[PDB]
Structure 1
């Protein structure tokens, strides 16, 4: 009955999707699929973050227009996300007419309300290329240790940090020319004006404890005005009434989510939903799944921008940690910096979705993909606990009972124990306590397999006149499988489709209250095969 708009952080167009991105998109998708299972109106929205100096320069290097380049990466990204079954209702681009209009609208409202300031700043400028240089596009000699070819505000030899203006014999990374300081008028968003409102939100109790504590650190350090303009040449949106000035990519990026929803509504011919979700009086819920590295933008700048332009603010922010492989940050040299596209050449999407989900929680802690554990856990939980309930019982049903399940539950009490768990498991999915949900589900899977072992179908099957007993036992196991797969439906989309084909029924949350009785099931190839370390080693080698 609820109206829910869920988003993920837009990936930058100048890089491929990797395991880090996947943690976020998978976490959001699991939540979204669960919400849909409970009957809510859900809109899962995302887009590609396509603006900025890095993108402009990359396109020039490739000898193609930025439009062509971002279009190609947009397609690559969507192909990868589709491969992992991330169920977006719309995947748009920050480089769109919807975002241009909404960005200009919000800026205009902020300006009229007195939240935009004008001030001149001094910045390194490449006189040959003819452009201001972001810090990472300036290189030179470290002022401290004198090591050459250091980039930006830090030295990778002695570890010193400094303003790029301190670099000795500075050189433009773009042209090799010596940059010089040049003045430029910039537009600033008055974030400080929203301090009280933001502090009230922080203490409201909606945000994760860890996020709130971090925000207090930021309030203590003090909020500052935000530089939201960038000089031409730039790939982005030009600022109205300010020739040669553009909106900094980060200003238009989150607005791109609004743009993506507007685009969806417009394509659907829906003239009412945009305002219903974004106006101040909205009764719809808005959630953003994001990583801790961008919390400053989404928890401070964003709500302030919306407030200042008369739009509703986020209902909540769901923050996740970093993804590590084998306990450490992804390493290219070790072949642990894994691309989403590469992953799919070796393993299926469900395996990673399951592993991440088993480790995820409502906190911001990092999630570790230990490859040895990945093999053991997938084989133990998916193949040996859940799918086992179907694979060890389906054969007898198809071969000896024409594929027809028993007319009654052999153990109603046990079945009730399984359906009684729906409340706690659903609450776990709802609260994003994924690890807890999986633990509950697997504990039930253990009970199901214990039941089968107690009945010993491999013994009953060889004994005279025990046909009825065999059908009863095997049918009971299949019904327990039906329940478990329902609880796991948000997690394993593909295995779920195969399970639904086998069971000849769509799995719904409430449907578990009615077991499958005197019901025909279909034969199946192999619902889920085992994986091994040889495959893991191949994945790593292919990633080097």
Structure 2
């Protein structure tokens, strides 16, 4: 395409300015804390439930999406804190621990390691990967509760529940049978009678029976606490009306939030009759814990608290901190309604989310991931495929479900690997490094820019600015395509100039070959940095092959610079990517298809 004279002029000028356009990068901090006058970016990924092995769908929607923005944020020299951790409390944990013959603490410890190992293999750059089963979780949850309680946002009511005294617990509708009080059907459930269709309350059943021990449950009244959401609806919508417009909340999250408010919020129970949970500091609640519906989102705070006692500088500092929250759309109500209401009702100057990033679902082939049916790739099986992490990262991010659902496809993975990585991105960077190493003893040639060279340079800068424009608004999927667009321009540039041929010609031809070569390898250097949020290992590999200086590796400016000036010596080059074969892929497809085992 055609650009203005000034656009080209500005691009060339910035490019020639070279390495000292780079600011002397600040030394890393631990713990990372907000700096006044600078941008401070707080990033959370939704806390995965601990006792389920995560699959690719879980990873792309949360930890991997958050990782890309986190890495980009650091390249922009923003003070970045990316945190996550395992969600561990609840009835599900008690049930699963029983099935595995372990204590709740035991099975949680076991599966936390599994999560941590999986995310470590996928190279997720957490600043903290924590847990919700800590004393700080208890302290911070109880504090927020007290603040809400003393401001009249907590209700207390009695609820009639069936209780199996033999099993010593309150029964869910699932585990209750009885006679229908409407038609006399003898096998009615606690939730509904399948004979007459009537939706009932389990407490209304005649001759109720526990499905487990077959004894007779009794109706007992138990005390529960409720969060008074209707009273908080006003201050919540004030905040939303103030922060939603002009934000980068994903459209699906915005619709979901508004749709809940249209129906009107109701008081929600925040207590449960469990043992495994955060204790409630109130009289008569010694055998009750906080419902994970309420305190799971507080986990973000306690995880940060275990990281630094200065955690309030992040989570109680809205004027300084921009919070990004990544999740799948199911988690949206807890992040757009529940915690904001709790925080706003606490009146403790809490940092609320500025940009809620919610994805749609990643499906597997023509259906769902399923552990029970053995369908789909789960996080712990990825390592065993012979396909490295960055390849998984590339494909998942290439098909990241942003506007609509996406589907993992083995055929598509092979096709996009061979076409975009091998025949495009890899083919450019391989040739750029090869030409330097083969024709110039590993030294970057002198670059004498022709008008055509200046055009390409300017095109690269404009696409780079497009890349920034997108990722600034968390347009992950499209920013990856900007990278591939640059390498596409680069391949076209190399192919039309044929430097590997001209190098065998006149001294004029040889100078052209040198210019093309040096310019190409500088584009290769830029790509390595742009690629870092997406494929961190490949990024490091390229930078090692080109011996790109560390300050150039850790910052991405909005202009295309000459990071590899003439005379710079590169290392030893080697093909970046391996092709994927039909035999290899069909074997993997059959393995995770469900037709086996």
TM-score by length of 2: 0.82
> In the alignment, does 2:473 pair up with 1:435?
no
Q: Which residue of 162, 169, 188 corresponds with 1:131?
A: 169
Q: What is aligned with 1:480?
A: 523
Question: Residue 239 of structure 1 is aligned with which of 272, 280, 299?
Answer: 280
* Within-5 A mapping of 1:247-326: 247-266=290-309, 271=310, 274-279=311-316, 282-309=319-346, 310=348, 311-326=350-365
* Gap regions ≥5 residues in structure 1: none
| Structure 2 contact 235–344 (Cα < 8 Å) conserved | no
State whether residues 482 and 512 of structure 1, in contact with CA within 8 Å, keep that contact through their aligned partners in structure 2: no
In the alignment, structure 1 residue 66 sits paired with structure 2 residue 104: yes
Query: Which of 356, 359, 365 pairs up with 2:399?
Result: 359
1:345 aligns with 2:384: yes
Structure 2: distance between partners of 1:149 and 1:322: 37
Secondary structure at 2:80's aligned position in 1?
A: strand
Q: CA deviation at 1:529?
A: 1.1
Identify which range, 129-138 or 302-311, moves more after superposition.
129-138
1-structure distance, mates of 2:188, 2:500: 69
The corresponding residue for 1:445 is 487
The residue that corresponds to 1:230 in the other structure is 272
Shift of 1:250: 2.2
Instruction: Give the direction of change, closer, same or farther, for the CA distance of 1:509–1:136 in structure 2 (3 Å limit).
Output: farther
1:457-536 → structure 2 map (5 Å cutoff):
457-460=499-502, 468-505=511-548, 506=550, 507=553, 508-510=555-557, 512-517=560-565, 518-536=567-585
Residues 1:185 and 1:17: Cα distance change in structure 2 (over 3 Å): same
Which range moved further: 42-51 or 164-173? 164-173
d(CA) in 1 for partners of 2:463 and 2:510? Answer: 31
Per the TM alignment, residue 316 of structure 1 is displaced from its structure 2 partner at its CA by 2.7
Note if 1:50 corresponds to 2:99: no
Does 174-183 or 5-14 show the bigger shift? 174-183
Structure 1 position 90, deviation (Å): 0.4
CA distance in 2, matches of 1:115, 1:224: 12
> Taking structure 1 as reference, are residues 90 and 332 closer, same or farther at Cα in structure 2, changes over 3 Å only?
closer
C-alpha distance in 1 between matches for 2:579 and 2:182: 55
Tell whether the 8 Å contact from 2:328 to 2:361 is kept in structure 1 after alignment: yes
1:434–1:105: structure 2 CA closer, same or farther, 3 Å change rule?
same
CA contact (8 A) 1:452 1:477 kept: yes
Partner-residue secondary structure (3-state), 1:513: coil
The 3-state SS of whatever aligns with 1:432 is coil
2:467 corresponds to 1:392: no
Structure 1: 4+ residue segments shifted above 6 A: 139-152, 166-171
Q: How do residues 370-449 of structure 1 correspond to structure 2 at under 5 angstroms?
A: 370-408=409-447, 411-449=453-491
Question: Which piece of structure 1 moves more, 514-523 or 280-289?
Answer: 280-289
2:369 — aligned with what? 330
Q: Find the residue that maps to 1:264 and give its secondary structure.
A: coil
How far off is 1:354 after superposition? 1.7
The C-alpha deviation readout for 1:30-63, integer Å capped at 9, x for no partner, is 1111111100011111111110111012212322
Q: Unaligned regions of 5+ residues in structure 2, if any?
A: 1-37
Picking from 53, 76, 99, the partner of 1:38 is 76
Distance 1:394 1:375 in 2: 25
Residue of structure 1 in register with 2:34 after alignment: none
> Distance in 2 between the 1:537 and 1:164 partners?
51
Residues 168, 414 of structure 1: alpha-carbon distance in 2 compared, 3 angstrom cutoff: farther
Task: Give the aligned partner of residue 32 of structure 2.
Answer: none
| 1: CA distance, partners of 2:351 / 2:134 | 22
1:238 & 1:189 partners in 2: Cα distance? Answer: 16
SS of equivalent to 1:254: coil
In the other structure, the counterpart of 1:12 is 49
- 1:503 deviates by 1.2
Moved more, 291-300 or 83-92: 291-300
**Contact 1:110–1:308 under 8 Å retained in 2:** yes
Secondary structure, counterpart of 2:298 in structure 1: helix
Q: Distance in 1 between matches of 2:139 and 2:55?
A: 31
Tell me the distance in 1 between the aligned counterparts of 2:542 and 2:198: 56
Cα distance in 2 for residues equivalent to 1:248 and 1:440: 44
Q: What displacement does 1:284 show?
A: 1.0
2:43 partner SS: strand
Is 216-225 or 140-149 further displaced after alignment? 140-149
Deviation at 1:154, TM superposition (A): 8.0
Aligned residue number for residue 158 of structure 2: 120
Whether the aligned pair in 1 keeps the contact of 2:429 and 2:521 (CA below 8 Å) is: yes
TM-score (normalised: structure 1): 0.89
Q: Is the 8 A contact 2:141 2:298 kept in 1?
A: yes
Aligned length: 534
Find the counterpart in structure 1 of residue 24 from structure 2.
none
Q: Which residue of 1 aligns with 2:10?
A: none
